[PDB]
């Protein structure tokens, strides 16, 4: 029993990380067989970050100009390109640890584990999600850029983020492996805020019938509801609006506890709009929105790699 | 920025995990030079918990008994031996992957990082607290019964934790490496009752640091205390008194922040004595006692390993 926050398993990505320097900027890469992925603003200085051209400053650089370095061994760059915004730099040797990978663009509303590294050393493994507004809320410091976001499915890493920028709110925004943004973001030092921070209402479900299986119940009540009634509520409330798809993917979790969607939603609705009383759930005084009802039933059945 | 609930990187544990199974029984066994370690109670029945003899129970186990398995590959048992509550099986090959290690005595209100494994095989890694009252509020189902705690230190992993119970109330209950439990803990299923769960003072102060360096301040008054008077508030809310140690452990936080120790102690107060009034801290909705002095310093300087 018990139902904690958990990251995936990290060496398997551990293997994959390397430093990347150009000029006076250090940041990490990630090595899988002879490419090396990394963010394009390593080759900007800070100034340059306000209104970079990144193929101009590109022109400027040379293969040896791209300083890679895995532990104690320097890698040699037989070529270099630049995918929106990625740069691939091709390497003279494949890397042995490469594990069996993909690369996938998620959906808000998804989660993953970050292995936050420096000089393209691991420094820890956290969980995270990927926003409704499409930033992440991760903890990076100067230097991290570059650190990726994973799930695994037995022996196969999806890497789905790797980490670009910081918004003056603190919070975080990066790309898939395509170099693509997630959301409006840009990597340029300039004026772009969040939207909303909408809670994700079929990732608070899932952690209730977690609750429930965990023995925590005390929120269960007499009552239930409707999509369109309990919607009403998700509005006033900033939550996701909860789609037939959503219950469908509960269903599971509904068939394992014996307690209807719609009853669940009930349960929520009370929550919100009567708050926790100075009561905890699953050791926490908030609805927790990032766990998948994926990762419910991965964590309460034991799922291994 | 941001301050996240963080394990360590886990992929110099996972090459030590193997699966150890004798009889009808099979949990995690921790794989270190030519020894493995995992749990005594791995020889009995679900009857034999009741009320086990295990030097009695030992004497119809021979080596050829413990069946070790490192993946797809099985290893060869040559001795066996029991220390405290743990089996030492010595095997034939000492563990290629086998890292720098110590065994280290853990004490309460000290972190670590969990890797909770099946089948020898890790399923997910998160972050723990050594309780007041010695058990660990942790993700353990059935089979996950060896699993290990640790730190790291660089490149040195300090084991501090095996799994082996739960008690009713679902919380955790474990032994050092050397099989001694922590706390009043036995290797029975028994009543055992776990105490009160105080609140490790020290832990939340860190964290309220952690906060302000991070940009959360509204919690930050004009007030200040004594040890002493703090105190007699911590005593009425279960928390762990402050001694002057603790204060000298938060030292380093205090000077990079320039508040003194003692005005953030009558911050924690005013936030025991009013509550959060609907309010956050670093995402959440109650005091964080499970991020140590060192690793408030640790994430918001990014050491690395
Ligand atoms: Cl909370």
Known sequence: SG???????????????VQVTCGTTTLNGLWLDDVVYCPRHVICTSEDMLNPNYEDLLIRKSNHNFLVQAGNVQLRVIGHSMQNCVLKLKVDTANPKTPKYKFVRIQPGQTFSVLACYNGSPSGVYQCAMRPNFTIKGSFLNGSCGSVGFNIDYDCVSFCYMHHMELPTGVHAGTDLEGNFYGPFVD??????????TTITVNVL???????????????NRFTTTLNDFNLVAMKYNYEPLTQDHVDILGPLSAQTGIAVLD?????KELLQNGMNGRTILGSALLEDEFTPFDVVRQCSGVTF
């Open 3 to 17: 139902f904690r926050k958990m990251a995936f398993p990290s060496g398997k990505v551990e293997g994959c990380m």
């Open 188 to 197: 340029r030092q300039t004026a772009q805020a969040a939207g909303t921070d």
């Open 206 to 220: 899932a952690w209730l019938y977690a609750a429930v299986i965990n023995g925590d119940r005390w929120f269960l």
């Open 264 to 268: 669940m939603c009930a349960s929520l």
